Design a binder for these strands. Structure first.
Lengths: 37, 175, 199, 135, 132, 113
RNA sequence: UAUACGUUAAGUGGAAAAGGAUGUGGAGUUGCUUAGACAACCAGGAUGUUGGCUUAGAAGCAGCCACCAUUUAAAGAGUGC
């Protein structure tokens, strides 16, 4: 997990989604895993 | 290119009862199982098949039309599947048994742990690692599967802990 | 050993047969790389040793203009720090003129700049000396003997007769690296000498 | 650090930013430009930061045709000082903008490389802009 | 398992002693079976595929040598081109292509002679050789 | 889609010119078993290829068999196919034709036996 | 608690940026595309060749050149594990 405002994926298996009105990056990788808040 | 566009069936031993506008019940060999719903979706049981229409070509009515298969809602994504989840642990002394229907648990702690299959589940412990939840509700079966695996979930630094038996676990290279 | 000694090795418990096998290969290639590095270093070192000996080969025949010329050669070698001054020649005893390659660079100027290909060339056969050439003069018995003679008594082995200078067409005279030239495809002529004929 | 080596007056009145770019609003010395949507006062350190960014993403990247030059100076008085006592002292340089103005053309390198290079260039910057190319 | 061994050699443990030591065969036993069947040149190279049934009932098919080997013997190279399409360190003939066809058209893997040659020349350019 | 028209055109050319052909489902067998089959049919000189079902059906009308992934073997054979089939048994022998003699499964079997 | 036509859902409205974003609705452009596309699922994903070099071994996957040709529906001298 990584907070930032400048969220965006890294790999291609990094995947863009939304959750609870908030933007997130799924990936396989926790060290790609992200979201804003 | 769609989930909901299908015409979704009434195979056998099935009995709907539209108890009101949106209150509906089902019987089948899987069991008798009932719900109540939103009014916009015009849901209509035909000979051997159910059909639904949405009043408005809208984002949520799409969700519903995609949950148009079997029992009542997402359980109108469930009946004719009919459900279970196995689980095999990954351990050394990690194991379990049952207290009747209930479940006895001997894993990683100064104490053991106890669990109950309240909702007509059958737990089956064919082996000390092999256990199976079985029922007819995706919600409930997956729910307890996760409840369990959260307790002693599996590990990165070793393959330990509970496992969704079909999982592709992250093998962090056990350091 | 497919040989059959049955060595009982060290194998490092808590570390796999794989791990320790490829670690054996790791130390193998490691000692291999270390020693091969050190052996090409030492190969550079041996060619450097005979490069001193070659510098000295020319130096024992060097004159003071060659002292300055080799100071330039060692700016080139990086070893020193101080304009067309190619080389010189001498009067052969056979009433000819022999170009006297008097240094590394003077040899470049007397042979690689001045002399002609397929000419008669000569260098001191393992004696500390300079080279010479009967450039565009196919050194006959007399001329080749006199040139090999001037070399045979101009070397630091001037006491040793039978200086066996390999002569032939300069077409085969090799050149390289840098300062790595040779005179090959060549028949040896053993010579002795007097001195004052050169002038 | 872009400079004018020589100047008439070390100092100026400050200036304003109204309206739009007179000229140089389109790539024609190069191929693939970037242009303004705003305007501000800009430093040679910033533009050369973009330079090194794009030319490392590209590693020699093509050719540019920079459109600008930091003609304007600006002053900066010393610190914890009161008003007056004459205008402050010249500090650095300034490069001014109008919206619609092109800043950097590019040529000799692929359009996609151009896009990403100027992405990394743009994210340096205080402004809003967009990619452009020749007619 | 594919092996790649000269027709006359036997008991190179390190190649197959692993490869069929988990299978557990006589190293020299099977390698001299191989030499008895391919009683031919040592220093040569035969590709040979061994098929083992679950009960350890091993059989195998020996096959024609590599064109790499034949043309190392032809041109006289040890390594192929250090950089094919930049260095060509070896040269053969169209006649050599036909010789190798007639040698190995049993093992060749395109029904036509010309498509056989297309594949053969795919390999010739793989290893970086020119034609005479 | 003029390129689609060229594709359908060329396939139509061969598909009209087809005078004897046996038609089969292909599924569940690797490229190497496939290439074994190809070796034996190549030496059989019975010309095997692979084509698509929309287009095959448009020819037949020019159908219930015709769905599913279908390959063909021209003549102008099915014994080799019996061999491969009983040897391997991941196929179907749905239909065939000889000089326009559109063939049942049992009829292609008779032609194949 | 006006009328008509659309908007948003954040209480934005009713406090602000860089920047982010399959948010949204609107127009508009443009290739695939019901000879059925895309996805899912099923079938395959092969041959010389483990391409050659180097490497103890480099075998699609240490690194270097090559990156060919064939069954071909198509499978790379290999996209990643």
């Amino acid at each position: 997990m990584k907070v930032r405002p400048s969220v965006k994926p890294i790999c291609e298996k990094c995947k863009v989604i939304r959750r609870k009105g908030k933007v997130m990056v799924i990936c396989e990788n926790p060290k790609h895993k992200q979201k804003q808040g | 290119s769609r989930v909901g566009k299908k015409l979704l069936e009434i195979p056998s031993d099935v009995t709907v009862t539209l108890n009101d506008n949106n209150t509906v019940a089902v019987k089948g060999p899987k069991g008798e199982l009932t719900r109540t719903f939103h009014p916009d979706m015009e849901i209509k049981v035909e000979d051997n098949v159910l059909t639904v229409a949405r009043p408005s070509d809208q984002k949520e009515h799409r969700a519903l039309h995609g949950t148009t298969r079997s029992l009542l809602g997402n359980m109108v994504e469930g009946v004719s599947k009919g459900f279970e989840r196995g689980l095999e642990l990954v351990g050394v002394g990690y194991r379990a048994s049952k207290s009747g229907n209930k479940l006895v648990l001997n894993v990683g702690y100064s104490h053991p742990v106890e669990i109950v299959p309240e909702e007509g589940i059958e737990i089956e412990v064919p082996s000390q690692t092999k256990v199976v939840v079985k029922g007819t509700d995706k919600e409930r079966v997956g729910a307890i599967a996760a409840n369990i695996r959260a307790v002693r979930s599996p590990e990165p630094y070793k393959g330990k802990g509970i496992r969704y038996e079909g999982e592709v676990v992250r093998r962090k290279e056990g350091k | 050993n497919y040989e059959s000694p049955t060595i009982t090795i060290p194998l490092n418990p808590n570390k796999t047969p794989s791990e320790n096998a490829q670690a054996y290969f790791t130390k193998y290639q490691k000692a291999k790389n270390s020693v091969a590095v050190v052996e090409e270093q030492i190969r550079l070192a041996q060619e450097e040793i005979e490069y001193f000996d070659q510098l000295i080969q020319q130096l024992s025949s060097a004159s003071p203009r060659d002292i300055s010329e080799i100071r330039e050669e060692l700016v080139e070698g990086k070893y020193l720090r101080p304009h067309n001054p190619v080389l010189e020649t001498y009067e052969s005893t056979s009433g000819l003129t022999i170009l006297v390659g008097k240094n590394n660079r003077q040899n470049e100027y007397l042979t690689t700049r001045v002399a002609a290909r397929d000419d008669i060339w000569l260098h001191t056969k393992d004696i500390p000396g300079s080279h010479v050439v009967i450039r565009s003069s196919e050194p006959d018995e007399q001329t080749i003997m006199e040139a090999a003679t001037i070399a045979a008594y101009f070397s630091k082995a001037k006491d040793s007769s039978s200086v066996p200078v390999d002569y032939t067409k300069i077409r085969h005279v090799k050149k390289p690296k840098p300062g790595f030239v040779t005179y090959d495809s060549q028949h040896t002529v053993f010579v002795t000498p007097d001195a004052d004929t050169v002038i | 650090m872009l400079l004018p080596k020589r100047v008439k007056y070390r100092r100026e009145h400050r200036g304003k930013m109204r309206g739009r770019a007179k000229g140089g609003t389109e790539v024609h010395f190069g191929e693939f430009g970037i242009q303004a949507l705003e305007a501000s006062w800009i430093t040679n350190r910033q533009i050369e930061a973009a330079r090194i960014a794009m030319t490392r993403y590209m590693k020699r990247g093509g050719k540019v045709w920079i459109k600008i030059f930091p003609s304007k100076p600006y002053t900066a008085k010393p610190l914890e000082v009161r008003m007056g006592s004459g205008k402050g002292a010249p500090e650095g340089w300034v490069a001014v903008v109008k919206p619609g103005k092109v800043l950097f053309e590019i040529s000799g390198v692929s359009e996609e490389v151009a896009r990403e290079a100027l992405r990394l260039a743009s994210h340096k910057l205080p402004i809003k802009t967009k990619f452009v190319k020749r007619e | 398992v594919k092996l790649q061994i000269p027709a006359g050699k036997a008991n190179p443990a390190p190649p197959v002693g692993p490869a069929l030591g988990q299978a557990g065969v006589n190293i020299m036993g099977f390698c001299k079976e191989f030499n008895a069947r391919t009683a031919d040149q040592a220093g040569l190279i035969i590709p040979v595929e061994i098929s083992v049934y679950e009960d350890r009932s091993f059989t195998f098919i020996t096959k024609t040598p590599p064109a790499a080997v034949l043309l190392k013997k032809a041109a006289g190279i040890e390594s192929g081109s250090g950089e094919p399409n930049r260095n060509k360190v070896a040269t053969v003939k169209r006649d050599k292509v036909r010789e190798i066809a007639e040698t190995k058209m049993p093992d060749l893997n395109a029904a036509d002679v010309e498509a056989a040659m297309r594949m053969v020349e795919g390999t010739a350019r793989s290893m970086g050789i020119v034609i005479e | 889609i003029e390129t689609k028209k060229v594709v359908v055109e060329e396939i139509a050319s061969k598909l009209k010119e087809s005078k004897s052909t046996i038609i089969v489902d292909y599924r569940g067998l690797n490229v190497s078993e496939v290439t074994e089959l190809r070796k034996q049919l190549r030496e059989a000189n019975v010309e095997f290829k692979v084509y698509k079902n929309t287009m095959t059906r448009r020819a037949v009308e020019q159908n219930d068999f015709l769905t599913g992934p279908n390959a063909i073997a021209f003549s102008t054979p099915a014994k080799v196919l019996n061999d491969f089939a009983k040897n391997h048994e991941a196929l179907e022998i749905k239909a065939g034709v000889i000089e326009g003699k559109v063939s049942t499964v049992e009829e292609v079997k008779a032609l194949a036996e």
